[PDB]
Structure to design on (330 residues):
């Protein structure tokens, strides 16, 4: 079997992407943030503290004839940006783009942090990292991908994120019309539960490519590109007037500047991020200082190839017994 679903940026900056997901019987459609950096499927629900809900579509388990309460199970997650949520757990039928899994753990939020409340366009997250990171206690639960794997034509999913435009998540097949040239595959380490891989280096603009190993994760749930301080300094040094601002919390640049492209290595292949992708617009309404899409990972502790990088490529998440990541230009 296969599935295919359109994913859409939530705003004009591509801060995040939402994908419609059908939950329950009859279907309740929620728009979820597909996150290859976490492993919980959680949703706003009828159980969420009413004051913490501000426009989200809620899942109502009592209206689903296939919903079952998972007795005594709870969940609690904290994300790298300080966001968090927690609640209880149902199992229910979940379908993405025609691909249906029965008995999927659907984590119902009782409490959400304010950053989720204020994001009225995101109804929940669908985690696509490895199941070892799932937070359900006392019995850990499997991701949607893990539950679907045996039914898929091929144990893969692909991310084709658009720049200021819709894109596609496909499950179970590789659309050979969606990319150019060939797919370069690279090894994945699952030791921390992430889609973790090693980039072979980088270049700024038309500068010389620097061969150097950058260990990082492929994370559709993170907006920006977080790289070592040395690399980020080399990039922003080429932007007249750019500087690191403590009050803003990262590199900012004069909005009138043209940004250079950023190249990262996948084995011997090169993926080029156009400079326009790195512009995240004015830091506040009306400001002539703009926020940069490449930032230092020094405070984060891990390098993150977020949407800025992934949307420049066609990305294959190969969940074979030895997992790999594939990148192609598009
Ligand atoms: N990386 C997971 C994640 C995704 C979205 C959000 C936000 F922005 F919706 F709060 C927080 C954390």
């Amino acid at each position: 079997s296969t599935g295919s679903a359109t994913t859409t940026p939530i705003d004009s900056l591509d801060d995040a992407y939402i994908t419609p997901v059908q939950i329950g019987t009859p279907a309740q459609t929620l728009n979820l943030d597909f996150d290859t950096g976490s492993s919980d499927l959680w949703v706003f629900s009828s159980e969420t503290t009413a004051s913490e809900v501000d426009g989200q579509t809620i899942y109502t388990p009592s209206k689903s004839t296939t919903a079952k309460l998972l007795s005594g199970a709870t969940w609690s997650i904290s994300y790298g940006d300080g966001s968090s949520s927690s609640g209880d757990v149902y199992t229910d039928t979940v379908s993405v783009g025609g691909l249906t899994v029965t008995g999927q753990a659907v984590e119902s939020a009782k409490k959400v942090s304010s950053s989720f409340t204020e994001d009225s366009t995101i109804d929940g997250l669908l985690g696509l990292a490895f199941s070892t990171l799932n937070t359900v206690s006392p019995t850990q639960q499997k991701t949607f991908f893990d539950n679907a794997k045996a039914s898929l034509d091929s144990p893969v999913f692909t991310a084709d994120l658009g720049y200021h435009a819709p894109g596609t998540y496909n499950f179970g097949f590789i659309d050979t019309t969606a990319y150019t040239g060939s797919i370069t595959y690279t090894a994945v380490s699952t030791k921390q539960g992430f889609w973790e891989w090693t980039s072979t280096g980088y270049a700024v603009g038309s500068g010389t490519f620097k061969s150097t190993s950058i260990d990082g994760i492929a994370d559709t749930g993170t907006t920006l590109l977080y790289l070592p301080a040395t690399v980020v300094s080399a990039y922003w040094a080429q932007v007249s007037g750019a500087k690191s601002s403590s009050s803003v919390g990262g590199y900012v640049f004069p909005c009138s500047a043209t940004l250079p492209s950023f190249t990262f290595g996948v084995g011997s292949a090169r993926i080029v991020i156009p400079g326009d992708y790195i512009d995240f617009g004015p830091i506040s309404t009306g400001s002539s200082s703009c926020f940069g899409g490449i930032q230092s990972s020094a405070g984060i502790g891990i390098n993150i190839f977020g949407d800025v990088a992934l949307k420049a490529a066609f990305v294959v998440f190969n969940g074979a017994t030895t997992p790999t990541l594939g990148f192609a230009s598009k």
The two ends are 25 Å apart (CA to CA).
